[PDB]
Symmetry: D2
Subunit: 185 residues, 4 copies
């Protein structure tokens, strides 16, 4: 890829979300590998977007339509928003706050990408078939070249991860290992 026009987008690597990584990769693996990607991006001056999801205590910013399998409006834990230490977060990283699965709606992600001259996104995080996938589908329609770092993603189960990796992502992205991405940058 063209490294000079590539950004890293890291979905929801925050302590509140890590317990939801059931497979195939552990939360610690996803975090370590996202951290390694971020260090490579920073060495070449390419933007690193660290996305987190959540709501105020009153859930005012949340979607509330009726659905068959709703998520409960529970009091979020104290650590909900905390980036894990092993991610290696630093001040130059661009923090994005989202209020639903996809990282574009209601955020500055697109603005930041376009104004920084980015045409390619490397995407990783949790969950592969939920927020990662909503973000990917949007990114592709917006015209960005997409790369999915397969071994820096995880989902509720290996099966749900693999179904997206095998059937959705190949049509909208290049699916690559962290190692392959590091070699291309």
């Amino acid at each position: 890829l063209n490294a000079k026009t590539t950004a890293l987008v890291v979905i929801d690597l925050q302590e509140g979300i890590l317990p939801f990584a059931g497979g195939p990769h552990t939360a610690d693996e996803v975090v370590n590998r996202a951290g390694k990607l971020a260090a490579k991006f920073r060495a070449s001056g390419q933007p690193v977007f660290l996305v987190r999801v959540g709501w105020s205590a009153d859930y005012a910013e949340a979607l509330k339509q009726p659905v068959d399998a709703p998520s409960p409006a529970k009091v979020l834990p104290e650590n909900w928003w905390q980036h894990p230490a092993a991610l290696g977060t630093t001040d130059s990283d661009i923090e994005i706050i989202k209020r639903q699965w996809g990282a574009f709606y209601g955020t500055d992600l697109e603005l930041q990408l376009r104004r920084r001259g980015i045409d390619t996104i490397v995407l990783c995080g949790i969950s592969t078939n939920i927020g990662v996938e909503s973000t990917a589908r949007n990114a592709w329609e917006l015209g960005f070249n997409l790369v999915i770092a397969e071994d820096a993603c995880s989902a509720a189960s290996a099966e749900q991860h693999n179904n997206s990796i095998n059937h959705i992502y190949p049509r909208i992205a290049r699916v690559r290992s962290v190692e392959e991405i590091l070699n291309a940058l």
Copy 2:
């Protein structure tokens, strides 16, 4: 029993055009999805509610297409002459609102959101081909935009039953109410 408020409900029919029918594989056939969508559309028309017939495609030069590299690209072949044709069983009428999209999701680059909001629609009944591709990209977008979603499960098909079922079991329940055509017709 499902109940819908007809006056704030629209039908959105994804890519039921002759060019796309071959891509259906299961667990409902293309013809089954088309016939069911036509019955849904008949009910919406009898209720005076909007029917959105969405179709996807590009000009001969493919200028409107996404061309980013992907692992499993679709060939830029000449489109068959029937590509855009509505199957007769949809019962297409002049009052149906034709939406033209250039990728999977039916919002980007279209007037779908404009039409829904300006017509006072808060609920979409969604159907078409493919369950986990354009139907799903549309649904994910519509949910984030705040619309209530009802998926007509048996008026959707994907490349395989496994792929349809994965979305119906793991994605759609979190963003929609998943119901049968029977249940939806009974609710309108």
Copy 3:
């Protein structure tokens, strides 16, 4: 004026017979149509995209905005010629037809999609009205990151004062403002 011709497109706002009566000044409808036609002929000869934007609504006005405002437009039956392109535009099959339902040409259209997927980074903008639909389109285009060039003598507003206020105080901050002959010389 320095333009990359290969990444430049022409966007012509609402030069349709129903809208021409609204050209009040300082340029006439004939001025705007003639000079938009000159621009379009140059873009076509260069193989660059020409977007012809038109505005309107179905008979039921279902696509129209209906919020309360102080000065609403009446929902009258549109004249038979409302949508017609003036002959002097030289409309051809390769021109890209954009249909909008309000002032700006982006909301609810494929204009952005078309520009980006065609590799366009620069827009030459003209049409009616300078401070209404042309300006809403311009403000949007600039926020979206497109380089903007306004063809000052191919725009008109309800009055010269309204046109001039935008040309003097708004457009210079978001665009390069040039005459049609200056733009033709740059392509």
Copy 4:
């Protein structure tokens, strides 16, 4: 008599920050706009309704800025240390919603639309500086997006009275109800 449902209305205060105040030429002074906007905000807070405090600016590297060539560019100067500061009369409190924008209009690249829709807001009262620049770009967007708009005329100011008046007289009436702060306070 101006009709508002306070509980589906929000206040959007554009760029009342110390960096921007010096640009208020007329017809209302910076202090007047701040004090009057503060009166609006107090009223909205007393109704339990969202107050959106919008501010404009860029990081030290201007990475978020628009950089296209224009005839009258703004210089890439180091922003003064007071650039982002809310004046005290606004009554900024923890429950106010801070919006950071990177250009004239307050929707592109922000959560403004998300916040309005998810909070059940259908009407915006708009004020701030400058009437025909950031306020107007926000207003044009809001109207196209389908929100009802009310402009608080005497809580806006522009580089000149001529520039303010032109928008108040010729743009805003077509997209908004234009009213005074006193009229708006009485309607809420």
